[PDB]
């Protein structure tokens, strides 16, 4: 059983760097290339490039070669994606996928969230009381989204339990 | 320009055959485009089905088969099952880059959403069950981080 397991979600400011890991198991790591894919909600999947795991040579898509780099830690069967000088529009889910040709075994995806590059200098004209009030006003909606996930996950769990128990 | 087109959506019923196609803007799809078919199921679960036009990935059920028909690549599902309800993407290689199609939403009529699970081994069911809570904890962390991003300009202002 072949599995690719990626690192957890990362949140960064523009200009920062992120590194995503993709840990491979169930086959000899250095016998197939590792590709990377970018996905955003309701936009097409985009190929970022591949790295040859035997030679270490990467091949990049034109739009990604400026700031995206691939690496390996062969002795740990890990491929890494490095995103440099982050832009708010790098906000996306990133997938590793093994060759091939193409995209055969996929990691589960890693969400990279990049905070705003826009001008929020106006908020320094607010009082601390008004800033804190805005901060606290975001909590109910977050808590509702989490509650919806907890309910969705109980709905996913029950049919598995029913299958074990039938 | 290299644009890959697929049907937006198709509907089938259990045991019947459905064909999905993948068209290229540059002309006829050939062997040299190494057509790849990939399935997406809920919570970002992607599974490669076919590579190199017609080579089924090991462990993929034999009801899935890839071919070239009428200048397009084609994924035929011969004997569709309820569990095949998913988005199907095709990717084509154009000399020096891969391009993904927009995906086809396949609907399978009738059925019960998790009936397929009862035929699984207990080992696979236990693995699925144990993977669930971590996955949902990852999704909750993604929400917390999305909110951290929303909060950041306000936090920066407080901390100035």
């Amino acid at each position: 059983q072949i599995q690719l397991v990626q690192s957890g979600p990362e949140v960064q400011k523009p200009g920062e760097t992120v590194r995503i890991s993709c840990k491979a198991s169930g086959y000899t790591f250095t016998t197939a290339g590792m590709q990377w894919v970018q996905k955003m909600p309701g936009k097409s999947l985009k190929w970022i490039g591949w790295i040859n795991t035997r030679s270490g040579v990467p091949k990049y898509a034109e739009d990604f070669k400026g700031r995206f780099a691939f690496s390996l830690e062969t002795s740990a069967s890990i491929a890494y994606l490095h995103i440099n000088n982050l832009k708010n529009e790098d906000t996306a889910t990133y997938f590793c996928a093994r060759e091939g040709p193409g995209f055969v075994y996929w990691g589960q995806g890693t969400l990279v969230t990049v905070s705003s590059g826009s001008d929020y200098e106006f908020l320094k004209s607010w009082t601390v009381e008004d800033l804190q009030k805005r901060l606290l006003a975001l909590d109910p909606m977050m808590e509702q989204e989490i509650e919806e996930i907890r309910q969705k996950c109980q709905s996913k769990r029950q049919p598995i339990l029913d299958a074990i128990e039938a | 320009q290299t644009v890959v087109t697929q049907e937006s959506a198709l509907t089938t019923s259990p045991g019947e055959t459905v064909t999905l196609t993948c068209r290229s803007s540059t002309g006829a799809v050939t062997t040299s485009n190494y057509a790849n078919w990939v399935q997406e199921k809920p919570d970002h679960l992607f599974t490669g089905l076919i590579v190199g036009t017609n080579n089924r990935v090991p462990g993929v059920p034999p009801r899935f088969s890839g071919s070239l028909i009428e200048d397009k690549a084609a994924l035929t599902i011969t004997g569709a099952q309820t569990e095949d309800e998913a988005i199907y993407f095709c990717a084509l290689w154009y000399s020096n880059h891969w391009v993904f199609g927009g995906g086809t939403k396949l609907t399978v009529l009738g059925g019960s959403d998790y009936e397929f699970l009862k035929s699984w081994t207990v080992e696979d069911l236990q693995k699925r069950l144990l993977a669930l809570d971590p996955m949902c904890e990852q999704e909750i962390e993604e929400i917390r981080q999305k909110y951290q991003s929303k909060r950041q300009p306000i936090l920066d202002a407080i901390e100035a």
Binding site: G100, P101 | G52
Partner: peptide
Amino acid sequence: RGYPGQV
């Protein structure tokens, strides 16, 4: 010339 990726 075939697919130049590592398969």
